């Protein structure tokens, strides 16, 4: 208390906490900050019943009104009861905040309905966020019926310009996750559907992607799977456009028999053809290689091959190449054992 407004203030707060031996609980957290720039009014309720009917309740009332333009508010409502034996829980949380011209609001709603008699659960969630320059909207649902889970995910990114949907499946100890992500910004016709599934020994691995920008119809494929004996994987990448086309195929065989791979690449540039092929096998009988690549430009061509056989009994390495480049008869014979 003083003749100065800025010197005079009020700070106070209640720290109530009561436990009755009836397994009864009570919490009060009060806050009131009385000042010339901000008028806080904080109060939270939380009462719990540790005896029969374990009802969970919680109320937050947040009122911090500033005397300079920013006006903050939020309230938390915690509703968790035991409907006869069915357990009903409701969560209502809202956060609302503006200063002078900027808007910020994200609302939320949660509902859970579980059946302990049968292990069935019904979980439902809602998300909506609204801002001055941002829009948030999401929904999550799930169905856990005693081991069988049915999870579905979806969201709306900036009014859904970017779509993301997910699907989770886990039944009879077999995981399965499926999801999609797509883009609707400018010419970016992006669309990826990642997929993954699991088992006791194998877990299939597949993925795709399409860029689809203007005249670029790019594609890439990833295909592989896992076992206790080897790892097969195949990456297939295709970048095609109006005139040129980028074609590559990657083949990877891994097993106890031997190491076999095939990275096949071809390119087509109008009057130019170049193809890029290898045969690399690595088994217990020895390393055998083969290289295949020919240069087709207009008419002048450069045909080349290369083979190899690394074996303890005998080594087979031969080379030969010929071309008609500029009318010149270029040729070599490079073979030796």
């Amino acid at each position: 208390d003083s003749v100065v407004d800025l010197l005079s203030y009020n700070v106070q707060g209640s720290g109530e906490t009561t436990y009755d031996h009836k397994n009864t609980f009570t919490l009060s957290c009060d806050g009131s900050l009385r000042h010339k720039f901000l008028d806080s009014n904080i109060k939270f309720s939380h009462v719990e019943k540790l005896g029969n009917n374990p009802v969970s309740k919680g109320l937050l009332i947040f009122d911090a009104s500033s005397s300079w333009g920013p006006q903050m508010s939020a309230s938390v409502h915690l509703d968790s009861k035991k409907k006869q034996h069915l357990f009903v829980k409701e969560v209502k949380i809202d956060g609302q905040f503006r200063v002078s011209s900027f808007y910020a609001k994200g609302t939320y709603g949660l509902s859970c309905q579980r059946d302990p008699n049968t292990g069935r659960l019904n979980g439902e969630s809602n998300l909506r966020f609204n801002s001055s320059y941002l829009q948030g909207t999401n929904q999550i649902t799930g169905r856990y019926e005693d081991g069988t889970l049915s999870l579905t995910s979806t969201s709306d990114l900036q009014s859904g310009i970017i779509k993301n949907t997910a699907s989770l499946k886990y039944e009879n100890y077999e995981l399965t996750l499926k999801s999609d992500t797509n883009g609707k910004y400018k010419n970016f016709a992006t669309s990826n559907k990642m997929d993954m599934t699991f088992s006791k020994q194998n877990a299939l691995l597949r993925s795709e992607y399409q860029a689809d920008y203007e005249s670029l119809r790019f594609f890439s494929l990833l295909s592989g799977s896992l076992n206790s004996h080897g790892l097969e994987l195949n990456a297939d990448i295709l970048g095609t456009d109006k005139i040129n086309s980028g074609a590559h195929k990657a083949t990877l065989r891994i097993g106890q028999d031997g190491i076999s791979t095939s990275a096949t690449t071809n390119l087509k540039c109008s009057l130019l053809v170049l193809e890029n092929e290898l045969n690399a096998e690595l088994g217990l009988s020895g390393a055998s290689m083969k290289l295949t690549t020919n240069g087709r430009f207009r008419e002048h061509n450069a045909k080349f091959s290369l083979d190899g056989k690394a074996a303890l009994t005998e080594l087979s390495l031969g080379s030969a190449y010929q071309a008609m480049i500029l009318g010149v008869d270029s040729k070599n014979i490079f073979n030796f054992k």
């Binding site: 374990p54 969970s56 357990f87 829980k89 659960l121």
Partner: protein, 192 residues
């Protein structure tokens, strides 16, 4: 090299060693070893109680005799008050529950009387009271053979029912491992 004239003694000795080893691991079971350890702990505890009971009296007599000549009886009285009386923590009222009052001294440890905590875990089917524990006799006190978890609910969403974690299962598994190891002998390796 493993079946020559000087190897029969080695084979017989290894067979005898396997038999004696099986005899010993027939004894280092779960409940057998638990009972043996508890009995040994109780025996050594009783012997230590007797020895400390003798030594406290002897040291008190020595201290009294020394103080009756050097006029230092005040320190002897202070030490006797600090050791014989110790301190009595009263009943403690906490979230876990009501802890009975206990005195930490020399005689309370001589008598081997422990008050276990009397706590009530919320949302549980099993309660643990304040059980008197005697350290001199432990072969018959608190024998973990049959234990089951109470059913409990967390976050009002995760309800775990009762699960019987019983040491007979582990004892059976150990005996099976014993039999499997004994059945496996070490001989010359196969060409495979």
């Amino acid at each position: 090299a493993l079946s020559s004239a000087s190897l029969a003694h080695m084979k017989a000795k290894f067979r005898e060693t396997l038999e004696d080893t099986r005899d010993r691991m027939y004894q280092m079971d779960i409940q057998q070893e638990l009972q043996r350890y508890l009995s040994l702990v109780g025996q050594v505890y009783s012997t230590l109680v007797t020895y400390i009971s003798d030594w406290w009296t002897l040291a008190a007599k020595n201290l009294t005799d020394f103080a009756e000549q050097y006029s230092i009886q005040d320190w002897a009285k202070r030490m006797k008050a600090l050791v014989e009386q110790g301190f009595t923590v009263p009943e403690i009222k906490t979230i876990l529950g009501t802890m009975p009052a206990f005195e930490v001294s020399l005689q309370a440890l001589q008598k081997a009387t422990f008050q276990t905590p009397d706590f009530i875990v919320p949302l549980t089917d099993l309660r643990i009271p304040s059980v008197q524990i005697n350290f001199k006799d432990l072969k018959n006190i608190k024998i973990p053979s049959r234990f089951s978890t109470p059913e409990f609910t967390i976050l009002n969403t995760f309800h775990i029912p009762s699960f019987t974690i019983d040491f007979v299962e582990m004892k059976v598994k150990i005996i099976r491992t014993i039999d499997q190891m004994l059945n496996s002998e070490l001989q010359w390796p196969v060409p495979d």
